C-alpha cells in the first residue's frame, strides 16, 4: 500500500533516519504512478540529506590529502579513504538519476513538475561532476548543462517570474556557471536578470507563495554580493 510506505517515510524523517526515508520513497516511485506534491517533496528531502552527508565528508578528506606534503603512507591512506567515499556518493547519484529517467520525467504531466525533475537531473549530474576523473568529466558536465537548459526554457515560457521553482532553478544554474564552467560573468548575469524580473512584480504574487519567493530572491542577491566583493 502506497499510503503505508508514505507514513513510514514521514516517521523515518522525524527520527532523522534518512537512508530509511530514501528507501521508502524509492519504493513508492517504483509503483509507477505519478507522485503527489507532498510525495515529490519527501523524495527530494530524503536524497538531499543522504548525498549531502557524503559531499561534506569528501571535502574534509580531499582537503587533508592535498595539504599534506610528503608522508607518503599517510597521503596514500587519505587517497584510499577519499576513493571509498566517492564510491558511496556515485552510487547514490546513479540511483536518483535512474528513477528520474525511468519514472519521473516521462510521466510528468504539468510544467511545474516537469521543471522540478529537470532541475533535479542537472543537480545530480553536477554532484557527479564535483568528483569526476579528467577523462569522463566533459561528458558529465554536458549532461548537467542540457538538463538545466531544457528546465530553464520551459519555466520561462510557462511560469511567472516570482514562482519559487523558477527562482530556485536560476539560483542553481547560475552556481553551475560559476563553479563548474568557471564563467563568473555568465553566472552574475543569469542571477541579476532573474532578481530584476521578479522585482518587476509590483503586481501579482499570491499570499501562500510570497514568503518562499522573497527568501530565494535574498539568496540570489547574497551570491551576487559574494562574487562581486
Amino acid at each position: 500500500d502506497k499510503n503505508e510506505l508514505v507514513q513510514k517515510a514521514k516517521l523515518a524523517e522525524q527520527a532523522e533516519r534518512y537512508d530509511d526515508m530514501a528507501a521508502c520513497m524509492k519504493s513508492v516511485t517504483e509503483q509507477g504512478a505519478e507522485l503527489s506534491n507532498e510525495e515529490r517533496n519527501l523524495l527530494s528531502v530524503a536524497y538531499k540529506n543522504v548525498v549531502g552527508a557524503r559531499r561534506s565528508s569528501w571535502r574534509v578528506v580531499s582537503s587533508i590529502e592535498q595539504k599534506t606534503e610528503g608522508a607518503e603512507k599517510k597521503q596514500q591512506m587519505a587517497r584510499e579513504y577519499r576513493e571509498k567515499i566517492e564510491t558511496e556518493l556515485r552510487d547514490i547519484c546513479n540511483d536518483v538519476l535512474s528513477l528520474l529517467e525511468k519514472f519521473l520525467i516521462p510521466n510528468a504531466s504539468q510544467a511545474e513538475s516537469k521543471v522540478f525533475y529537470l532541475k533535479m537531473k542537472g543537480d545530480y549530474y553536477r554532484y557527479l561532476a564535483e568528483v569526476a576523473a579528467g577523462d569522463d568529466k566533459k561528458g558529465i558536465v554536458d549532461q548537467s548543462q542540457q538538463a538545466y537548459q531544457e528546465a530553464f526554457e520551459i519555466s520561462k515560457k510557462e511560469m511567472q517570474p516570482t514562482h519559487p521553482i523558477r527562482l530556485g532553478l536560476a539560483l542553481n544554474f547560475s552556481v553551475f556557471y560559476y563553479e563548474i564552467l568557471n564563467s563568473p560573468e555568465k553566472a552574475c548575469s543569469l542571477a541579476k536578470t532573474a532578481f530584476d524580473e521578479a522585482i518587476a512584480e509590483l503586481d501579482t504574487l499570491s499570499e501562500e507563495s510570497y514568503k518562499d519567493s522573497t527568501l530565494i530572491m535574498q539568496l540570489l542577491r547574497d551570491n551576487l554580493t559574494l562574487w562581486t566583493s
Binding site: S44, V45, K48, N49, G52, D123, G168, L171, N172, V175, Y178, E179, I216, L219, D222, N223, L226, W227
Partner: peptide, 9 residues
C-alpha cells in the same frame, strides 16, 4: 562563507 544552492540540508 559558502555560496547558496537550494534545497538546503
Amino acid at each position: 562563507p559558502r555560496r547558496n544552492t537550494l534545497p538546503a540540508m
